[PDB]
Amino acid sequence: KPYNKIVSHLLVAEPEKIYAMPDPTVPDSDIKALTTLCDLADRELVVIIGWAKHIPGFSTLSLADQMSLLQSAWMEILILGVVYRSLSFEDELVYADDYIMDEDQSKLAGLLDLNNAILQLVKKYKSMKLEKEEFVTLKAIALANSDSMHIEDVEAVQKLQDVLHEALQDYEAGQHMEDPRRAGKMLMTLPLLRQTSTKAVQHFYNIKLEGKVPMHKLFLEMLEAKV
Amino acid sequence: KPYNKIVSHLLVAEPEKIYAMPDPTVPDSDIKALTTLCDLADRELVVIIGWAKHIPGFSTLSLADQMSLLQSAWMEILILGVVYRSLSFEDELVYADDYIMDEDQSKLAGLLDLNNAILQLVKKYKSMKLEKEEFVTLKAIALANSDSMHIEDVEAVQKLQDVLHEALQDYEAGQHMEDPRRAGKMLMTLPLLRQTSTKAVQHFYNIKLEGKVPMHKLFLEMLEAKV
Ligand SMILES: CC(C)(c1ccc(O)cc1)c1ccc(O)c(F)c1
Ligand SMILES: CC(C)(c1ccc(O)cc1)c1ccc(O)c(F)c1
């Protein structure tokens, strides 16, 4: 009854906010916004890798299977983060406290369609009143459910999926008794997340080939894995 | 205890098998396979539209909202069908009884990567022993959960989602007592379905622009809606 330990644990393992710090010496331009965003992503992925080791069972997989999960799920983790930070805002995406993209900046950056898809994720979660407890559980599920076609131990990854789905089911059964289907509702938000992340990955891989926007090693490695 | 009526109803509303009938006068080629497949799709979409009217609540939405759901979900419905027909096969996709694609034909048709993604859907469902009862419920859910960004009555579509998610939850709670999380497991197969269908839509829209493969009105209309 007090509530689910995995959800508690995920809460306290939630990394601290990080700043985008767009270079205040560089004139605004699409290249500046895209450099800034992929710079921020590269920093967030460091923190994401650290965070994953908090997920029960995760650090017990092979390094290869750890990497495979992260290489598949990184973009959905990143997007769920900007979605969650944006729930109190209206038509704006809080990439960071100092980097809030409105429609006008989305257009300038060539990101109007993707950001509009991400806004559709925010809109659904706003209506569902997504809680931080659910947000963290969904990030972890998104990692374990990431559909890497490279898993060595398929059964241990399906066990990690089970563990986390259970934590979601138990959280919802204790906290959200008014809706016996709230857990399933949350799971059904995942296909739009996968959809958007698939398009974001394509967008950014294209940006990388085109080579106008500098990217860092970690973000490039993730970008370069199965796409 | 006998079991869930919506699942029963979906079962009996399941359309009959249809044949691909590749033209036995046309020499085999990528254009022939792709013509045949988009021809079959066009015929299946007629039957899919008919079928949807069986789903409780569906025919009560606006024609616009009916069309919007179908325009978003058509490809995931089609793919789930070929996946389901392929579960008893090994590395082969049963587009129709007379049209079973192996790896060699996938390569010839430029479909090796997509068909390999579809095979990954089959592999997961084989391990899960997907039943016809689940397959039909998942098709219906995929329709209601299709994330059209054009819905007029958002609340009635979320009610259709609720109804069908409930039918899945009840089916699993009665039939699959050995796994209290089987319903959620099924829902978590949906992101790979959305992933694959997003890539299939892009693939085929490209095929259409390129104009080497003739397509019929219905398939073209669905192809032309938000992409
Ligand atoms: C991957 C990236 C660069 C990003 C996403 C989240 C985040 O917290 C940092 C960067 C990103 C993805 C899709 C977008 O429309 C976007 F603006 C930025
Ligand atoms: C949309 C289409 C043409 C199709 C899918 C299912 C079906 O039953 C008929 C056609 C299709 C999609 C993805 C593929 O890799 C494919 F081979 C065919």
From Swiss-Prot, chains A, B:
Superkingdom classification of source: Eukaryota
Keyword list, A-Z: Acetylation, Activator, DNA-binding, Isopeptide bond, Metal-binding, Nucleus, Phosphoprotein, Receptor, Transcription, Transcription regulation, Ubl conjugation, Zinc, Zinc-finger
BP GO annotations: positive regulation of cold-induced thermogenesis; positive regulation of transcription by RNA polymerase II; regulation of DNA-templated transcription; regulation of transcription by RNA polymerase II; retinoic acid receptor signaling pathway
Tissue expression as described in the entry: Expressed in the heart, kidney, brain, lung, bone marrow, adrenal gland, trachea, spinal cord and thyroid gland.
Signal peptide: none
Chief location of this protein within or outside the cell: nucleus
Cell location: Nucleus
PTM entry text: Acetylated by PCAF/KAT2 (in vitro).
UniProt entry tagged with the keyword Transcription: yes
Quaternary structure (record): Homodimer. Binds TLE1, PNRC1 and PNRC2. Binds GRIP1. Interacts with NRIP1, NCOA1 and NCOR2.
Job description of the protein: Orphan receptor that acts as a transcription activator in the absence of bound ligand. Binds specifically to an estrogen response element and activates reporter genes controlled by estrogen response elements. Induces the expression of PERM1 in the skeletal muscle.
Family that this chain belongs to: Belongs to the nuclear hormone receptor family. NR3 subfamily.
Protein name per its UniProtKB record: Estrogen-related receptor gamma
Species assigned in the record: Homo sapiens
Gene (name only): ESRRG
Residues of the full protein shown: 232 to 458 of 458
